[PDB]
Amino acid sequence: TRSEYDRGVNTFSPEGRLFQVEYAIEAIKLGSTAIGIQTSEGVCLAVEKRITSPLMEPSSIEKIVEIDAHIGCAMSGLIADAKTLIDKARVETQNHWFTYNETMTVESVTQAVSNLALQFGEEDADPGAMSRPFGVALLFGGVDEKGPQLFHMDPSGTFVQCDARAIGSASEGAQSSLQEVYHKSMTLKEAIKSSLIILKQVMEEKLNATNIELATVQPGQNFHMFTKEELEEVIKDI
Amino acid sequence: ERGYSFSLTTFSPSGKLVQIEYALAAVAGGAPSVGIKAANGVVLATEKKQKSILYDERSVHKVEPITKHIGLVYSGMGPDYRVLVHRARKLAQQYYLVYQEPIPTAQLVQRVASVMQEYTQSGGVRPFGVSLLICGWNEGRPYLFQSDPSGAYFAWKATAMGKNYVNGKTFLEKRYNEDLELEDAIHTAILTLKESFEGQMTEDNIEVGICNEAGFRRLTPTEVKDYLAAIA
Amino acid sequence: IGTGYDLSASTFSPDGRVFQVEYAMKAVENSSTAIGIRCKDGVVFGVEKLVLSKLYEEGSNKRLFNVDRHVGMAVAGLLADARSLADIAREEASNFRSNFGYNIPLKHLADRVAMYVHAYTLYSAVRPFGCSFMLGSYSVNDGAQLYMIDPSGVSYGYWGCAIGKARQAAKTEIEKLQMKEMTCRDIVKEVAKIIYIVHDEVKDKAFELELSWVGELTNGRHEIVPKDIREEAEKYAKESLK
Amino acid sequence: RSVCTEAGMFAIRARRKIATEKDFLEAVNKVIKSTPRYMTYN
Amino acid sequence: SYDRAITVFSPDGHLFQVEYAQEAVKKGSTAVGVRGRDIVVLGVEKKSVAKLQDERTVRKICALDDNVCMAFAGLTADARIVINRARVECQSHRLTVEDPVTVEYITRYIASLKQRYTQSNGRRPFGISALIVGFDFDGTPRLYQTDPSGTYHAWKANAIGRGAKSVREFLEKNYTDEAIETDDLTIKLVIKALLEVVQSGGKNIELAVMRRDQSLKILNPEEIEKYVAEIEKEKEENE
Amino acid sequence: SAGFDRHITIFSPEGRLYQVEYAFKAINQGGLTSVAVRGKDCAVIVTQKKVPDKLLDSSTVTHLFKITENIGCVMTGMTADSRSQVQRARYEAANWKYKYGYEIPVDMLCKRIADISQVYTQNAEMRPLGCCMILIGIDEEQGPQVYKCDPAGYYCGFKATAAGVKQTESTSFLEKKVKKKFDWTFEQTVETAITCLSTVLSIDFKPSEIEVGVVTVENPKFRILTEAEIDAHLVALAER
Amino acid sequence: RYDSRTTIFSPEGRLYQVEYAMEAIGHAGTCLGILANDGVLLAAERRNIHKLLDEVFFSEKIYKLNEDMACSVAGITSDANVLTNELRLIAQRYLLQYQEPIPCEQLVTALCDIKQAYTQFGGKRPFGVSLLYIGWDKHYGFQLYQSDPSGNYGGWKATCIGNNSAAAVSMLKQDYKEGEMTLKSALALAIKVLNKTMDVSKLSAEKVEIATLTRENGKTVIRVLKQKEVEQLIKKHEEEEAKAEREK
Amino acid sequence: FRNQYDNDVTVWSPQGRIHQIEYAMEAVKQGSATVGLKSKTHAVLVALKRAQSELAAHQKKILHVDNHIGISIAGLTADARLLCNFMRQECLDSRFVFDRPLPVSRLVSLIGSKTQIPTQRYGRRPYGVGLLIAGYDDMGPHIFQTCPSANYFDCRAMSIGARSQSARTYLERHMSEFMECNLNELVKHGLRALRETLPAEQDLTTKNVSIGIVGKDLEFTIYDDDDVSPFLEGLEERPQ
Amino acid sequence: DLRNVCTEAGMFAIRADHDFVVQEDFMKAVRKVADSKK
Amino acid sequence: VDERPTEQYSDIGGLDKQIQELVEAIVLPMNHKEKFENLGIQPPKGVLMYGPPGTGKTLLARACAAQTKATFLKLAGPQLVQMFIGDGAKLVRDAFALAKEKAPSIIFIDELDAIGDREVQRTMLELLNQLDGFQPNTQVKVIAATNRVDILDPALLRSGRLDRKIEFPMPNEEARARIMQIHSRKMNVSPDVNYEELARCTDDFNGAQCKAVCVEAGMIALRRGATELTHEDYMEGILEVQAKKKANLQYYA
């Protein structure tokens, strides 16, 4: 009888598992696949658009968003929950830039975002906050003093440094592929080719301009989201 | 229908709140009380019968004055009636303080009905299990009102709630006349108590209070005994 | 069995009893045994502390707190509940000192802490403190008192009492002991031997004995039994238990 | 196995001797599941 | 179970209360909005008043500000509340920054308000869907759709309410670049989309049009018959 | 029919609050019994004492307390609830003394504590303090008063009252005594109370199992009957 | 099921507590209002006059809110009183803030916003009260609005709410000549509606509660029909009915 | 269901247990293993890093809260991180107001007081995190194990997490030496315990282990794959 | 409970192997029965 | 019936006091019923035990049935709560009735049972008024094992019905060792193993858990490649037991 421990986040199972947090974890599997890879030359983020209607404006679907010029984001989960998470991430980045007048590292960014998360079971929610776990998984990538850096954020608030992490409806298959196709000194161009290969292999529909949003961050340039023509150039090779 | 008889903030699919009706049922199980509006004044009566004559009847009173001209009587719980008395006294004194004028009984009934209904707003607090009878005299006119646990308030020429309220109401509608006099009003109220009193009302077994142009006064036991002897 | 009425501490039973308090009673009864005895010029305390693993340091989970400089603290039940109760009692004693300017009488401190633990009994959003604790003190102008306060919130004065799984056994074994005459010296040995007999070796073994006292022998100050007195008490326990 | 059978039937429906991936997609859309997941999740 | 709790995830990771609130929009009335090169239009299906209801206060299309309009579907009272809050926020934003509110900002505010109304117990989600239309002060045609879940999306021509799927397919099959070349072509498109579901024509149809910053006038009941007459003339022209 | 006995704030059909009666039974759950009797100018309260073992300090197991210097109190039921109730009563009495500048009458003190209990029984945020209360005292122009308060918030004046497990039988015996219409001098009030307890328990108690408190007009201070005086009273009764 | 606190959504999307608040109005007394060319009126049924009600009152169902405002109530008495007090409060607040009598639309929207807030959130039972606001303004002359426990409202020229409200409104719409009714014709129509909708062969003036709002000489006057006036009106209608039946 | 007594920490089982507290206790058995040892003048924290996948970095289990006191977490990440922030704030407050390090005993006492509140009152879920606490103060090193039941133990060593019983038995067996070790010997015993809880097919690699050491003159420093290389260079081979 | 007291006294009689009962036997029997009652 | 239960008290271990009580409560009065009627009192018509699940309550019942060669009936406790209204004087009476002709007999109640909610009331009314209507010579006895002491009916826990009460405690440490030993005498286990260490590693383990320990230890002794003569297998078995599945659960630090 798991049902009594199902209701509510403040209930411990006989196995000690947080079942509602587990359900928030599984709610990621309803989001479109997002793939991020860590390379010495930078980090690339590739996502699946899952366009409902050809009439929809593609720019509205924000799988990849800019937290700061030096950092990038990729998302998989509830759009609303993410939007709040992204706004908090940007606000905290600007708070760091105000107080310390420096570009805050992506590890500290994911630390602060996780601080906003994992707060569902807290009494500080009296003014108003989330009484349920956030149901969106975050893929943070960027460049900092430690070179390029990629971090994946767990809806429970856990973050880990991942050389190549895939989140979304197809986390298992894309992660299994990245397990054997990833290599440490892999160049940024071949990394982006590998990411697009995995996305093509795992996508439900065929690969085109409107099925993927691509982002890249390298130590030289700032956050760059691949425009249409750049997408065509990178997708003709594959 | 059972799942909707447990909360005060959920509507039954067919009708309305059931906890209000259950509080009204608690009211109906209380000590019988009657109130009669005469031409010149108003009288209200209730029975103080309780076992164990050890009980000091003078200690508590079921008929209390709100101000110099307003009196009230309940039929139901005692402690809820006491709380209602305190609240009504507070409202009357607040009205007096702001307007520097004795509070008209109609406004008092509206305010006390609002007070009782404010306990029916939300769950976790129960409605008062007490129905009030408000007697008053102002503007050359005697007033008689009944306040409900639901917050509904209405006027009454002559009514009787509590235990055996239906027979009391039938007797009153068979006896009450608009041209009644105060003394005959008290006689009718005492007889209405008597017909279901079960135990030969004494001077202290019943408690009555009268209100007229000379304000509201709870009758002393001597006058109650005199009226009982006159009725016999 | 009281099903349907024991889910909260603000709901009575058809018999008219709050079952949450009785379950806290049972929790205390399923815990270690601690005893205390009030001598002519002070009180002494004894605890059967079970070392659950040899890995724990000696003195781990100190069960004999000191609420005030002159007030003892012997507890049984849940160690976390006991620590919270000791902390709130310390806060109460500090507030009494700050407001009234003198040491809190043991009867008044017991009354206040019992009031608090009762206040944690009659709500529904909180749970009764599942631990029974002892209170002991010695004042030159007041005397020596001993108080046992259980999760029920009751605070009775005991000549010398015990709490734990060996409640009744320690009651019988302490009854034959005559109590009112001697001082701490001729009562620490008795406390040690009573604790050593009530403890069962075949099941629930590996326990260590710790004692504390307050009195004029330590200038009305609660403190642990000194090492020399502790070891001579242990030797008396060994020779008496044969 | 029912999904594979339905993919075969879908291929038969278009009178094609070879079943395509689209036929398997439609078969799994029919058997499995016997806007809500596309407008709030993404 | 997992359905009667707003902030409880189902085992398959669904907030079923939010989805039920979303589905409550489908029980409303059809409302389609199309944006063109210089015009944005709001076509809704107007319920036929029986004999006594005043159409003046059955407002389905309401203007949040001089540069934004919106049509809702799903719950009149919740709609009224969100409309009042949206205009209050538009005025407050113009107070804070002195420039007129862009369609994106007001849409984001509405979505955030509905979201914050669907993140705690004791707060029923706003069971309406909104079609935000208008022009930014730079003069760009933007249309937005807000979901009861608290999310928003950019649509070139979307439909909400009952039968919104059929109107969606109609727009998919009929939204072309040349179909919005002139204002009359956009009007023809939106009227055809409406008649796809409300086939009677004439009445049961309300249109509001927005050209470049003119303080939109809803098409009064004197040219809607004229516009549907032109639609029928074209309809017999091509067939 | 049933199932409405779970929440204090829930009205059952036929308008019956079960939880209040459940608290009333929790009063008897204490296992003790007390009686109070009032004379022309005296008021005596006496309660039974049960001591499981000599291990307890008999001086701290008292069941009757002192609210103010001239108002006494005795209670039965859950003893922790009783101590909380006397603490609240002392608070209320001193606060009344502060606010109005004169000693709290017994009737008003009982009224206010019953109002507190009613507020507890009206909202579902409390357990309604399942312990009975009996107060005694002297008021000018009225004489002695004996007042009883219950968890329901009901308070009344009593010429003679009781509480505990033997409520009904003690009340019947007190009825039999009161219907004889006798003056009830101080010694005879104490005698009648002790006889009530003895007959209702059929124990013929030793003098060490009872505590007595009396208030008289000549001694308005609530005096707790010490061991010597209770010994005198009850041994004289035994011989008388 | 999904019949718990009002802040719940049925899978089909229905707000069942709000629906029950809707259907609860059918238990209330029947009240109707009709819009005439040069006046408006509110006709209400006194469902509870047993033998001994003092009738110390101006109107139970009809409640005056402002020198230009009047409305009839239909629902639980407590929610009725609370809503009427809030109506007076908001009307006087608007008068204080703007130094102008509050428009009917604005006041009705304020009350309906309050009612929606009572079903939008908080775990509070919605006001089971339906209202019929009567008033005049410079903006739209004479207006009639019918409220709703759900927090909705509508502008009507003829509307009946209470028991047998469906049949009453059906026959009313069958027998309403818009734009060509004076106060007298509206009164006769209201009397006929109350006759056909109440469970009495010959309804008495006591069971009928009628208040008329009319703007004349710069100011709007709200008056309830006196006992003699309402008796004359009902007797005129019964002789009209007698003439109709003898002619047939 | 007879297990309706495990839904919140505010209900007792009829056997006198808080089943939800026990579930919180067992929750930390789901975390990875971690052991700690202490010498005369040095306390060590060695934890078994776990990775979600071999393609991502290992989860950090040793957290630095102050120069003299450091902790190791084993349980839910959220509660462990919240407790870490609370300890950091408490230590900073101590350094600000008293200019002295918080004694480890006082810090663990405050930890227990803080995590007892969820145990007692409805609302916050009990902190389901087992913590190994190691620091320095006047009376030398200490290692403290904070159980999720708001109970803590002063221990010479302890192992919390998955398959911790084997490590506990290893420490019981080698008890007689821990006190008299230097840095290398105690680190070696800790690594052997972590190898004991590790299964046969796995071994303590540089990425799999993390070391935290505090001492009299050496501040609490966390060691990683390159930093644990010298500590593993002297390691003996697994006794397989 | 009283018949239980008697039967338990009879049972106590054969724990110490008597063919009869004693007064202390009745005391300990009623003690055990009272504890079972609690 | 399972008439041959094949026990000799060498199967039950760590319950010496318990089996002594069982013997003195059932079979000692059975053979000295004469000394009972000399006292003028009736023999105990039914024993009772209680304890955590898997502590050997059924094994001791089977052992008593073996040493007394008495017919065994394994009446279930949770099964009887269902089967509609009728599992009172239709199955319980059926269980008792025809057992009395092949009557060296010991009928056996098992896991506690509930000792809307009216069917269990009827079940226990049938129990009390059928067990109380017992046999004079008491040639058939009842043993009424349960699982907890929380729920007790005084009408059953009184004299006659269920007065003889035996507590089954959790095996402490050496009882754990004894259980391990007993469940490992049929495997060719070398003296190289150390049962005492396994016993001190069996904290919280209760009875049948140790049997599962032995079984799993043998299973992996096969898994190691049929490597007989091993104690490391006992160690790993102590680690896995019921918790053999290893969660691999994320969001745990």
Ligand SMILES: Nc1ncnc2c1ncn2[C@@H]1O[C@H](COP(=O)(O)OP(=O)(O)O)[C@@H](O)[C@H]1O
């Ligand atoms: N002391 C013991 N010695 C040997 N085996 C035991 C012991 N206790 C329990 N067992 C094992 O546990 C099982 C019996 O469990 P038991 O407690 O009788 O069942 P239940 O709890 O379902 O009534 C048997 O397989 C038996 O071998």
